Amino acid sequence: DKKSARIRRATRARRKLQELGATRLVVHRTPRHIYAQVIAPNGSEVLVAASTVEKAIAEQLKYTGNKDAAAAVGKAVAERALEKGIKDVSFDRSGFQYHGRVQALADAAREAGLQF
Footprint of RNA on this chain (CB under 7 A)? 1-3, 5-16, 18, 26, 28-33, 35, 37, 39, 42-46, 49, 51, 53-55, 62-68, 93-102
Phi, psi (rounded to 5 degrees) for 40: -60, 155
Q: Is 95:9 a contact under the CB 8 Å cutoff?
A: yes
Residue 109 and residue 103: Cα distance in Å, rounded? 9
Please state the closest distance from residue 26 (CB atom) to RNA, in A. Answer: 4
Compare residues 28 and 110 and give the one whose CB is closer to RNA.
28
Please state the closest distance from residue 77 (CB atom) to RNA, in A. Answer: 11
Kindly report the number of other CB atoms within 10 A of residue 12's CB atom: 10
Please state the closest distance from residue 87 (CB atom) to RNA, in A. Answer: 20
